[PDB]
Paper text:
The chromatin remodeler [name] is recruited to and activated by DNA damage-induced poly(ADP-ribose) (PAR) chains deposited by PARP1/PARP2/HPF1 upon detection of DNA lesions. [name] uses its macro domain to bind to PAR produced by PARP1 and PARP2. In the absence of DNA damage, the macro domain of [name] is abutted against its ATPase, which stabilizes an inactive conformation. PAR binding to the macro domain relieves this auto-inhibition upon recruitment to DNA damage.
For structure determination, we collected cryo-EM data of a non-cross-linked complex between ALC1fl and a 5'P-10-N-0 nucleosome [name] by PARP2 and HPF1. Despite a high level of conformational heterogeneity in our dataset, we could isolate a set of 5487 particles that yielded a map of the ATPase domain of [name] bound to the nucleosome with a global resolution of 4.8 Å. Nevertheless, this resolution is sufficient for the map to display clear secondary structure elements, allowing model building. The map reveals an ATPase motor tightly bound to the nucleosomal DNA at superhelical location (SHL) 2, where the second major groove faces the histone octamer when numbering DNA turns starting at the nucleosome dyad. The map also shows a clear interaction of the C-terminal ATPase lobe with the N-terminal tail of [name]. Both of these features are conserved across almost all chromatin remodelers structurally characterized to date. The ATPase motor of [name] aligns optimally with the ADP-BeF3-bound conformations of Snf2 and Isw1, compared to their conformations in the presence of ADP or in the absence of any ligand (for Snf2), consistent with our use of this ligand to induce the active conformation of the motor. The ATPase motor of [name] is otherwise most similar to that of its closest homologue CHD4. Notably, our map does not show density for either the macro domain of [name] or PAR chains on the nucleosome, most likely due to their extreme conformational flexibility in the active state. The structure revealed that [name] shares two conserved features with other remodelers: its ATPase motor binds to the nucleosomal DNA at SHL2, and the C-ATPase lobe interacts with the N-terminal tail of [name]. This interaction with the H4 tail was previously shown to be important for remodeling by [name], both in vitro using gH4 nucleosomes and in cells with the point mutations D377A and D381A in [name].
Residue numbers in the entry:
A (entry chain D): 28 to 122
B (entry chain K): 42 to 500
C (entry chain C): 16 to 118
D (entry chain F): 25 to 102
E (entry chain E): 39 to 135
F (entry chain A): 38 to 134
G (entry chain B): 16 to 102
H (entry chain H): 29 to 121
DNA sequence: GCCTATCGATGTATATATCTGACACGTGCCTGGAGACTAGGGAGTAATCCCCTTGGCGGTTAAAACGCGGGGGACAGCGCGTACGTGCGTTTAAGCGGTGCTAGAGCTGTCTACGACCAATTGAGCGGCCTCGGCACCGGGATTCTGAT
DNA sequence: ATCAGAATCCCGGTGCCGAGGCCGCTCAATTGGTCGTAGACAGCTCTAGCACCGCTTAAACGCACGTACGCGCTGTCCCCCGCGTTTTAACCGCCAAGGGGATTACTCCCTAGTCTCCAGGCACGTGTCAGATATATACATCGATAGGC
């Protein structure tokens, strides 16, 4: 019978990271899940558009990084950017 | 009739008269000034008063010479009604109604910017001829000047120079073709590049190339006319930079520090490093704010370039030797620095610059002449042409040029229609600098040119 | 897992899968999904901070849409990011213009 | 049945919209504006319904319509 | 006694700004939606959720435009909103035809 | 002597500038300002010529639109003179922040 | 004296009459001069946002010239569209 | 170097509605960018429609409804009729 | 005729459109009907636009269409104005407009 | 205090003149389009399950509606004098024609590091049923107010 | 002025259950090796972009003046708010069909990709005349004065 995936457990665990004592509501989780999708939707559109404008078959980290700096104001962008490169560093240094 | 002055005149006139009796334009490439004007005006009265061709003549010459050009007309040819089209748009408008609607002239005297704007009259009203000298804009086939002038209504025209070919063969076939393009258009279409294989036939048949030209161009050399045979000696001053500009030199090659932000050599643009390196060796205070205190006048100016460190003593020494000088600068701001040095010394100078009006230029000639003014401060492009600046015993190129033809033109402000003293010419070089490199590349252009291009009456 | 290999809580493989299906390009290099996942996890946390604070301010532990809206309308870049965006039951910032107020 | 949008409902909304005082002419204008807005939304949602061969509208058609009309609402759908 | 004019209006604003709940009677709104939709197509069925989503979006959409009208009146140095204010604001949004 | 009444010539100007379509800022200043701002983002960067003209089109067009909104704002205030707050209101009601 | 020259900031090089000329094209009849500086500020914010994204396109392309398409993509990504400069 | 454009097609269409007229390169440039934009708008929506309806394949039905989702009604109705006429006579070939 | 556009009786390049769609990534697959339908729509739109611009040009005594004429047409047709609301035309200018308050009396 | 003139002021429209560069047009050239071809599974059909929206029932209450006083804001009109539209003369530097340089955009060819691909493997995370105490929401308080003196 | 009292919070109590957890499982993410391509690298080309000068001037700037507009001020009045009133049907909890959705098995047509052939489309060069532009009208409309009456 029917099945559907979510982001919910990740958000939930991230909540427990920031505020282990703190709870949430399904309504809020629904809002968060939609929000997560919309951000992904926005980034991917740019990443596609960038690759096309750069005659590129292949999206990679550059497209995400620059798309983020296009989509986000402020140090919020650069925090995210640095986490991205950091996470990519961990990934690339990991095996 | 006009005057008899110099031996080469009548031979040149008879050559020119023959050329136009051959019913073609032609080129006279003799040395600078030499009264080619005079021989041309003799040709005009040969028309007006031996052929009785009083068809109205037109002349284009540079803004710097117009008044002296009138003077050359006034000296010997007031027998020709010569009228000048000049001044504010109103003045230009009136002269149309007053003269162009009236034909009350033998000669029309004009300059390039005006004649371009007012070309309609020069299309619409038939001249006997145009004549142009200093015509080196015609090196460039993209010049609207040539494109328009080649459309203007003339029977024939005379092309004059004493500084032919500033860089390359395209300039020659341009100059060549634009006089008689009805034949030579295929040349500028590039067939001549084939006919003489881009000059690569070179010394092995340079006679052949010049055989293409000697039927059509006359050139006679000043050293060949000899006559006054003054001295012209060139010397070159390889001297080092001062430590301040040396640091700026490193920074321009590398990085500016925030000290050079307070002096603001950063927060400024960088997309012509050559220009900045040149300024750096020339004088760092050419950069705004690089003068460490704008209120001062002092030795810091004189020291902040190794040139001025020498040139102060040199100027004082030369002036003390009674040697007066023309200083030619690549950039007006260095003339300002030189004038700041004059003001700092209280040394007395004349200046001509593109902002200076031709009447002001003319009086500046009478002011650097006639009295012991230490120096004439001259913009190379505006000031290099024509003048009889014999009052200076010397010339110094404070900053090196990119075409030695400019140096020749500037230096040939001596000796034209005579000079009667020893003249020394001095070239300043930043020792171990780009100025050496520019010098070497400039010398390469020289070496590329005369070794073939010298043909003419030389052949 | 790739997620664990990145040290991320967000599902790198799922992100990669979504990129595959999303046709955003012919091809994707391995760094892209890694970097993108980190971005999403980071932005998720940053929001959840203010949401928890608003809940704490509201003396609640179950984060609720009111808190989310208030948070977004109190972080300008997020309010800008979500300027075209609205939140169910979120309401508005309580504020009134001085012209309206009693003396 | 547009009057089913009650005057006091409009006033309640305007109070959340920080309006201190309302001239009655506002109410009919409000109903007008809202009707045009709703219709344009309804249009696209039905279109997605038709295109999906559905007889039944979904909030997905709504959120898609909103997304096409320069709006988005997190919380419904997904 | 009476409360003075516009005094309790502010408590009402504070209330409705502090609270976050829906402001419109569902059945009237649903009826309006349905009997509009019937002119797009016959017998359109609806997700129950869709009605609420529409109502939320509608209320939100008005709320912002209302506040824009408030500023417009305020800029006109008036405290009573008037239809001209809405028409200006909608057109300054560029969202009016 | 003679003088035109206030605004009379501006009306001819307005009509003239509604018929004509050329760019209105002096290009050379506009280029300089852009290149300064560019340096403020990126110490050194070149420009294609056409890019500058594209910017000036967008800039003047964007400005002209904002003028109309401010004009209507002042008119809505029953003022013929425009003042900066009308622009701020316009931007606010344009939703441009 | 001549040793240096001081020059007005190109922001003010957006001349008073140029603003009026543009404002007149916007149908502005009558202007209080504060409009002028206010407009410059508005334009500066407007230009700044576009330029930053444009340069960002340029850098992702690793170009040294700003490319006109970078402006087009900047404008369009910022939700404004302008034909006649390619597309 | 070589690049495509719509220009010849626009040109011929112009000679339909206004034979004995011409067009500036500026206008033709403008027209091309405009055609580019319209193409982008429809195709992105067709993607979403197919994605929402799970289709791997863009189809004419997506095109029709996408245009309906973009044009004011009469333009859409005309456009739909024209696309219908073209497609039907094409497939009848 | 080999030309598919000719079999479609269109002007617009079915083949190029089909290629563009194939390369457009808008979905994994494209059905043979989709290109034809879009091409006809674009051709129709272009004509409907160019006709009004051509009229405006002719009314301005000019045989050649220029950006002003496009802008006028696009802004005179309010449906084009809405469709191109988020769009600007270089050197297009604007429609004439004076708000009556500004007129002298 | 008009309201009609009046000259006439200075305007832009509309006149016919010659003029050019941009544009319709023809060229050789060629790659993307068209004419074939197959492969296979995406999309379609009929199929059943059951959920959901539908329409419906009831009673209770809150919301809507309506009647009212009025005072407060909306509004009109008035005098005040600011600052800004205008026409002036003066200056600047915008615009333009050059001059000259080369950095880097754009192309080229080479390759091989990278990712797409397919197979099998495993538990990740999903859904179903579970219990709980943070949530509402309750009654009844105390607080903290306006607003009349 | 202050005190009244109206209606706002704060509090403990009742209690409900959506939230939070655990289990069964499956399928997609992981691990693993292969194919071959993109696109990264390196190189060469020459454009168009950068820089200063020489020169014209349309333009900006600044000046002085008067206008009417923006503005603060006034009073008028009426339509709003706050309110008790009666009336209404939204509400909510309830019921129960059965339409429509969501479901799967079998299926062919359709498109992806194949290669072959080759001209529609293009880059390029062409001629030429539409809009360009000269400057001349015409007669506008805009004006003032300030007509008369």
């Amino acid at each position: 019978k029917t099945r559907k995936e979510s982001y919910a457990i990740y958000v939930y665990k991230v909540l427990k990271q920031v505020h282990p004592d703190t709870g949430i509501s399904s309504k809020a989780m629904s809002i968060m899940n939609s929000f997560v999708n919309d951000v992904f939707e926005r980034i991917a559109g740019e990443a596609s558009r960038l690759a096309h404008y750069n005659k590129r078959s292949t999206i990679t980290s550059r497209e995400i990084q620059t798309a983020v700096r296009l989509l986000l104001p402020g140090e919020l962008a650069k925090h995210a950017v640095s986490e991205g490169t950091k996470a990519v560093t961990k990934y690339t240094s990991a095996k | 009739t006009g005057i008899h002055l110099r031996s080469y005149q009548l031979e040149g006139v008879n050559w020119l008269a023959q050329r136009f009796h051959c019913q073609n334009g032609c080129i006279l490439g003799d040395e600078m000034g030499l009264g080619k004007t005079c021989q041309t005006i003799a040709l005009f009265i040969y028309l007006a008063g031996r052929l009785n061709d009083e068809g109205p003549f037109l002349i284009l010459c540079p803004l710097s010479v117009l008044s002296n050009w009138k003077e050359e007309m006034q000296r010997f040819a007031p027998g020709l009604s010569c009228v000048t089209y000049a001044g504010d748009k109103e003045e230009r408008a009136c002269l149309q109604q007053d003269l162009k609607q009236e034909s009350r002239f033998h000669v029309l005297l004009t300059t390039y910017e005006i004649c371009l704007k007012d070309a309609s009259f020069l299309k619409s009203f038939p001249w006997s001829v145009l004549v142009v000298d200093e015509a080196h804009r015609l090196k460039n086939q993209s010049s609207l000047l040539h494109k328009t002038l080649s459309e203007f209504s003339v029977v024939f025209s005379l092309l004059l120079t004493g500084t032919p070919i500033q860089n390359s063969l395209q300039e020659l076939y341009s100059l060549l073709s634009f006089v008689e393009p009805d034949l030579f258009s295929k040349e500028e279409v590039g067939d001549f590049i084939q006919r003489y294989q881009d000059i690569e036939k070179e010394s092995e048949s340079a006679s052949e190339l010049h055989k293409l030209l000697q039927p059509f161009l006359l050139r006679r050399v000043k050293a060949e006319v000899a006559t006054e045979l003054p001295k012209k000696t060139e010397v070159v001053i390889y001297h080092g930079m001062s430590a301040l500009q040396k640091k700026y030199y490193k920074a321009i090659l590398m990085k500016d520090l925030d000290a050079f932000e307070n002096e603001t050599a950063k927060k400024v643009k960088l997309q012509n490093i050559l220009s900045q390196l040149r300024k750096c060796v020339d004088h760092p205070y050419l950069f705004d704010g690089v003068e460490p205190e704008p209120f001062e006048v002092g030795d810091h100016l004189t020291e902040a370039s190794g040139k001025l460190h020498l040139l102060d003593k040199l100027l004082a020494f030369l002036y003390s030797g009674g040697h007066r000088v023309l200083l030619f600068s690549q950039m007006t701001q260095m003339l300002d620095i030189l004038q700041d040095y004059m003001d700092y010394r209280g040394y007395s100078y004349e200046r001509v610059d593109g902002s200076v009006r031709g009447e002001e230029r003319h009086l500046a000639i009478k002011n650097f002449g006639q009295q012991p003014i230490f120096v004439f401060l001259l913009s190379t492009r505006a000031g290099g042409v024509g003048m009889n600046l014999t009052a200076a015993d010397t010339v110094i190129f404070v900053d090196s040029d990119f075409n030695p033809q400019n140096d020749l033109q500037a230096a040939a402000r001596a000796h034209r229609i005579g000079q009667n003293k020893s003249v020394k010419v001095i070239r300043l070089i930043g020792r171990d600098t780009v100025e050496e490199i520019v010098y070497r590349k400039a010398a390469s252009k020289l070496q590329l040119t005369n070794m073939i291009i010298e043909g003419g009456h030389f052949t | 897992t790739r997620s664990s290999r990145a040290g991320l809580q967000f599902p790198v493989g799922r992100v990669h899968r979504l990129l595959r299906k999303g046709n955003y390009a012919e091809r994707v290099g391995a760094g892209a999904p890694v970097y993108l996942a980190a971005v999403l996890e980071y932005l998720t946390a940053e929001i959840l901070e203010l949401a928890g604070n608003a809940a704490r301010d509201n003396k609640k532990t179950r984060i609720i849409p009111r808190h989310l809206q208030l948070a977004v309308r109190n972080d300008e870049e997020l309010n800008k990011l979500l300027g075209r965006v609205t939140i169910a039951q979120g309401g508005v910032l309580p504020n009134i213009q001085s012209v309206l107020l009693p003396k | 049945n547009i009057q089913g949008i009650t005057k006091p409902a409009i006033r309640r909304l305007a109070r959340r919209g920080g309006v201190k005082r309302i001239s009655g002419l506002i109410y009919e204008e409000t109903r007008g504006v809202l009707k045009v807005f709703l219709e344009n939304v309804i249009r696209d949602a039905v279109t997605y319904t038709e295109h999906a061969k559905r007889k039944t509208v979904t909030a997905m058609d709504v959120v898609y319509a909103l997304k096409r009309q320069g709006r988005t609402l997190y919380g419904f759908g997904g | 006694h009476r409360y003075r004019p516009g005094t309790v209006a502010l408590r009402e604003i504070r209330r409705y700004q502090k609270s976050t709940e829906l402001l419109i009677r569902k059945l009237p709104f649903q009826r309006l939606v349905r009997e509009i939709a019937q002119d797009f197509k016959t017998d359109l069925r609806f997700q129950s959720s869709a009605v609420m989503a529409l109502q939320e979006a509608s209320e939100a959409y008005l709320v912002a435009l209302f506040e824009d009208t408030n500023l417009a009146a305020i800029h006109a140095k008036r405290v009573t909103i008037m239809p001209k204010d809405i028409q200006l604001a909608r057109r300054i949004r560029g969202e009016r035809a």
